[PDB]
Amino acid sequence: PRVIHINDSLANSSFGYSDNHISTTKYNFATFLPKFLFQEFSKYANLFFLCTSAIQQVPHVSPTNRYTTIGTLLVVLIVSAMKECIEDIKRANSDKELNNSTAEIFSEAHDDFVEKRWIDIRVGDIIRVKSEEPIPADTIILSSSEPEGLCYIETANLDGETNLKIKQSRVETAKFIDVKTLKNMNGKVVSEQPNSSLYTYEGTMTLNDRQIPLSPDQMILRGATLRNTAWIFGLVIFTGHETKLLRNATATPIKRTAVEKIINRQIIALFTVLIVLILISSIGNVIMSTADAKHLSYLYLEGTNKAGLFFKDFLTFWILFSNLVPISLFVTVELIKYYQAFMIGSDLDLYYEKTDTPTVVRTSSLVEELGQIEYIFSDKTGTLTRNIMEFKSCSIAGHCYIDKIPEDKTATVEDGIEVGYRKFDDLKKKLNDPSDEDSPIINDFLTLLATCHTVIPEFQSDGSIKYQAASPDEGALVQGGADLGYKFIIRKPNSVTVLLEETGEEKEYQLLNICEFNSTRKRMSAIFRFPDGSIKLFCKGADTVILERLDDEANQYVEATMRHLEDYASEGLRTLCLAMRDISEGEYEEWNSIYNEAATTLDNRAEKLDEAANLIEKNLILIGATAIEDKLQDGVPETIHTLQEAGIKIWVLTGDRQETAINIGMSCRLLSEDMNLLIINEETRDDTERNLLEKINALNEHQLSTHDMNTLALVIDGKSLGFALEPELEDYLLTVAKLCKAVICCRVSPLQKALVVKMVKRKSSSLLLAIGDGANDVSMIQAAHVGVGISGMEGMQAARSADIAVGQFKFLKKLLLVHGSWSYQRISVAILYSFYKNTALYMTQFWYVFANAFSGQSIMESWTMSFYNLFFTVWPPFVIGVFDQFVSSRLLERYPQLYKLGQKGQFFSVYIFWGWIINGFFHSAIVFIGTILIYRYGFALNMHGELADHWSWGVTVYTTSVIIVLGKAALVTNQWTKFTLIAIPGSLLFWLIFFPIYASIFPHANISREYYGVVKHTYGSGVFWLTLIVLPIFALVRDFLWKYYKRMYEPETYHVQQFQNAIRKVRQVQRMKKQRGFAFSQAEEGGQEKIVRMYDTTQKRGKYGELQDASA
Amino acid sequence: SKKPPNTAFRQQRLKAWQPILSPQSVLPLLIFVACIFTPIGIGLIVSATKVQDLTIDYSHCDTKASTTAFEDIPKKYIKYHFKSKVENKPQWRLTENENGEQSCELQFEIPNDIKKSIFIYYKITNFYQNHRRYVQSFDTKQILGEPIKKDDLDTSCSPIRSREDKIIYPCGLIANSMFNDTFSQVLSGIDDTEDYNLTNKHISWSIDRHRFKTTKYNASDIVPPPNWMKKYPDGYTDENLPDIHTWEEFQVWMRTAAFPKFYKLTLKNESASLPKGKYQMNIELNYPISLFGGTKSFVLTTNGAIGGRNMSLGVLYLIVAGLCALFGIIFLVKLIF
Ligand SMILES: *[C@@H]1O[C@H](CO)[C@@H](O[C@@H]2O[C@H](CO)[C@@H](O[C@@H]3O[C@H](CO)[C@@H](O)[C@H](O[C@@H]4O[C@H](CO)[C@@H](O)[C@H](O)[C@@H]4O)[C@@H]3O)[C@H](O)[C@H]2NC(C)=O)[C@H](O)[C@H]1NC(C)=O
Ligand SMILES: CCCCCC(=O)OC[C@H](COP(=O)(O)OC[C@H](N)C(=O)O)OC(=O)CCCCC
Ligand SMILES: *[C@@H]1O[C@H](CO)[C@@H](O[C@@H]2O[C@H](CO)[C@@H](O)[C@H](O)[C@H]2NC(C)=O)[C@H](O)[C@H]1NC(C)=O
Ligand SMILES: *[C@@H]1O[C@H](CO)[C@@H](O)[C@H](O)[C@H]1NC(C)=O
Ligand SMILES: [Mg+2]
16 A cells, blocks of 8 residues: 655655656657657558668669668658657647646745645645645645535546535544644555545545544545635645546557558558569569570670579669659658648637637647548537536416527417516516515525525625535526525524515524435425524425425416426426425424434434435425526537538537436437437346347337438446447447437446447447547547547646647537548648659659660669659648648538548548559650650750760659649649749749759769769750650640549539337337426535534634634 | 737638639630640751751671672661752672771762761660660779779779779770771762761760870779770780770760660761762771671761751640640530530
8 A cells, every 4th residue: 555654755755656747748758769660660651661771782783872762761750750849849848837837835844835836746745725726636635724624626527527525624634724733743644556446545544643544535636626615735645647537648649540541551552563563674684684695795694593683683673663652751741730730720710719728739640530530429517518507597386587588489378388488577576566476476486596505605805795505506596596686695503594685684594404405316405494483394306206295285386387397498408396385383393303313313314314304395385496507618509510410420428417418418409309318227237238139129120211310319327338338238339329310428437438439449430539628538538539628727637638629619610620621631632642743753764674674774863863752842742731722611611511521531542542653654654755756866966966865864854754743733733822833833943943053063072973964965955945845745735634624524512100109118218308307416425414504604714714613 | 828810821811823724714825835836846847857867777788798899788778868869879898908807888979968067976776875784884983084993993893894803994894895886087089079077076075075084094004895805905005005085986985875776976077068979988897786686877967956857856746736726626616515
């Protein structure tokens, strides 16, 4: 186990624990060489040219000089290492703003809390966390400002649960409330090992000769946020990369994109053209040198053996033809991918103005994977929802009241049951009239909004009051109640007081008993003695629990309330039915005796107090119901509808409960009305395999229409998902998940969010995206093809470890439909050109072997051919892939079904790769046959009878093959900016100026000595300037006619009830038509029992900070 | 503080031009091409048909020619293009001397006054100057004149660099295989016809006369190449040592060719014009065609603007301007249908 001493930093570093920093970067200084070389050698062009450069080293073999291909390989391996380093520096200083954040650290020599950074937190260091501050390490609290040393933490980054969890410090350690007495802590803390189990911990602290048995109620984790309390004095235990939420988060893994897996197949498809053309040229060398051995006696050929110089000439044609594989293809597409990530992160439509956060692309190797997404694996809490709840509307006395009326849903003629909406001022006018009979039943409804809670009120320095609620549902009932008058102001240990607005009266209600919310109860209740003296029971809960406890003799608003709940849940709101009963004075004292013997019972009190609570909640009167709106982020329902039109299938993986995710899915229009829920809630591994087989026996017995599959939805609990990922059951799950429109997975662990993405990845060829926030979906982001994080909203940890960090969820529309489909279509054209560009030049070496007796003589100079890949034809691959919008950004957003062109892979295959390589063969045979009919005997010049030699003709072949391949890029490109004018006709003017300067300086330095008289006999000759302007027009006359023919013609785009009565009879299938949607976010570990007894609001703060004593 | 700027370059809305492909847009492009390529295309054909030449394949002169009188050459060995009509076919005879070395004397008629410059080439077919073993096989420092010792010689001139613990001075396959047939530097007029002297100076390239310098070897450590051993039977002395700075027939041979059929310049005359007459060229036959297996010829061209009688560049300008004048009409054909 881990041993931690308190208040001695020298003794708690000799064990050698980690520090508080986390590393986001792909590599350190140590692992830069193996991880970058394995990433580059997994590309097949960089592995072929490493083998080629060794073949040039055996003597007399290479036609060019021996430093030709190793000089080109060291250039591209340095430019590729520069792109990697300037991303891992940007990954290191954006990582530095986390480690350099503020953290008050107790210093024992100073004896006060000095400001330091996060990274200076060692294990054993007592810290202080203020209100609304993130916790910097795995911490066990010692004391706090609240009564009995308690605090509330928000765990929306630990899981998706949107409520607050009470953490209570031990009674033996809660006395240490002052900074000056914090120097008397001496002892040890025996902890556990890091195990990534979020809800379990065991530890034992020996503080001043006394054992303390610690608990998960005393431990707060790193992703949590301290809320609704002033300060805490906890010491840390795990830190950095041994915390419970960042154990399995690793460095950025090598993610091989899907386009790079296609290039590796077109290189294997180019070795089979390479090996054939080496074999054609090397069996012709054996035939010709032995048939014509008496006619080649001026070569002084040896004739050692037919297998000896077969191999010695096998390697010569290996070298001469090696540049069929493009050497500058992968570092060209890396800088198209780097610069496209720059233009993604510079867009204003992907920039969040509220937080002043632009989008950033950290792993820029995956820009073109955003055009082929087929499954989006989203998270709910924080990603889809804003984590803010507001009281939307209420239904009382068979009438509904809302803030502002949507005019189509207004007060209409009823069907006997009143539907419609009224304003809240009509609620005020019906309340102040003693002539209207709803005014007593409105009055006890609004006081139930401001009494039955467990909210603690705290007055600020102004007249503003802050409501401190554990559950955010009942916190919005008090705030939304108080906006209608009856403001809840202060709370005493045995009473609450409500401040009436329009009269100014402050009525005080004695809180007698309260009954906790429970997931088995689905309701909570409280009994209040009024200032009249008449006590009264209030109750709020689910309709499937409330309606079994009513008086049908009394109330007449029941069937008017239930129809208002169906109108609420179809809109997506979270409902709650409100009931009461007027209990008189005598009926209480026989029940409280029953309640007291249940409460003072030491054991089994979890399930006997509710069995004492249902003895009083039997005969209730339904006042009405409320509706709370969980706020989604802006543009969430329009993004989900647009991405589903593009063919992407949205899944939701959330750590929240099931009744919330169905409500959010109904609100964000994943689920809808007229839709069926294939619910899988099973407790054992054989109960789910029955449930998976009972559905697939029923929904694929007949072939389903595409209209009817849009009425199916899969909902699976996280415990059933742990059994439906056993490898015997993995295909029954995907068989029903692929026939459903939406899949929702509820209460899933951080690891199970990765094992779902790892299950669709290896069972299909589709590309997956995973968007989330917080550290509960950080393993989901490492496991996806593209991982997106939501950026800084006080809890960033997914946006650090992500590949793209966006501002909110609505930016996923323009990132996929515009920047994703551009980055796939532009890169697919820039790769098919770079394959073509090395075929139109270097295949003139192959037609030359029939004209030099299969010797392998180079047609062009050794260093001139390396400049082809590096200077003169490297810009039109760049500018085509970057500045050439093939279709408008206004058209990609308007018609989202154009996204399916990139999903099928119509632009980038291996079959369409053959239309460019054969186009490279045809262009290479025109340069060769065209420049051997000109320059027939070398007798093409007019310079006093001088003749053009082997090297004056080789410059005409090189220059004609440059104007051909730049004239092809001038027809391939769609849009002519001013950056294309420097690339396509500006690299021709580059070569026509570079060549007289290179060949009049470098031959005098004994470099490229074949150019001593070439510039006079090329540039001064009239036959060279007339060759350059008639042979590219001759070879591109088919490409100008096919491009014109492609524009005008040949265009491409850039029984209902027989199943719906059968699917309901399966075991756990529910339909969304008359579901009365109940949701309450309170938990059993929320501590709503004793916090109402411990607070006196009128009592003010102590001398040691904001500390309040237990007023019970 | 972190907001990117709203320039048109950062927001991917640069000012751009998209190609309108339409029968009103690409039509004045195809007409401007096929109205500027046809005065160029016929201008390269009218220049190639003003080149006057005569090509006599003297390959079988040591076998098919009698040593007594002037018989006629078989017409399979004769190509010629002139302005005026020829009247007599060219004639040929073999001639041995007192040493026993043969000579081929070609008589021919030139039917009109050729008032351009006259260049004498020899054409060799089936000789691979462009073999990979052959192109790189010479020493660059030896051509510049440096007295290189044995083990620092260029190793690409490998089979011919050292015979008997010595230095082959022009090492390599290129200098060893040099064409040995000595064209006589005068076209001897036969009857009522003057002579025509032909210079063998300024024959090679101008950068070749600089980099080919006389050797700084001392003629006691250098041996000729093994195929030069008939001209230097005793070997290299200080008297017979070749000056490759003024040996401009050797500089033409080392400037290797691209294809196995090539010309090499031997003689020229820029100063005057040869008139119509019966001339005679004598060729000392030293190079056997059994060494390489092809033919050797004698060429008497004149120069045009694009070289000689080569119709290929002017035809390439008319195929392109033929397609750009064809499809300037077939725009109107598929549109109406
Ligand atoms: C013009 O160029 C012609 C082709 O380059 C050339 O013809 C060749 O000349 C060489 C030199 O005489 C001939 O080589 C002879 O080879 C025979 C064997 O077939 C030998 O009698 C002799 O080699 C000897 O080798 C000894 C050791 O190996 C050496 O010590 C001796 O000195 C001696 O060199 C000859 O060298 C060759 O057969 C000729 N024909 C071909 C087809 O190569 C012409 O002579 C040349 N003419 C002039 C005027 O320069
Ligand atoms: C003469 C052999 C040529 C070598 C063969 C060759 O190039 O075929 C491949 C081409 C593919 O079309 P592009 O390469 O122009 O690209 C097209 C892309 N969709 C674009 O928009 O540019 O097929 C045709 O044009 C068929 C016409 C054949 C007519 C013979
Ligand atoms: C080019 O050819 C002409 C012959 O048409 C040469 O002119 C003759 O040169 C000789 C020199 O020996 C004189 O004796 C003649 O009188 C010249 N004739 C005429 C008509 O000028 C001329 O020298 C040649 N050019 C050279 C050798 O460079
Ligand atoms: C011109 O030709 C004659 C004919 O043999 C020759 O004697 C004379 O030397 C030549 N003139 C020159 C300058 O070489
Ligand atoms: Mg979340």
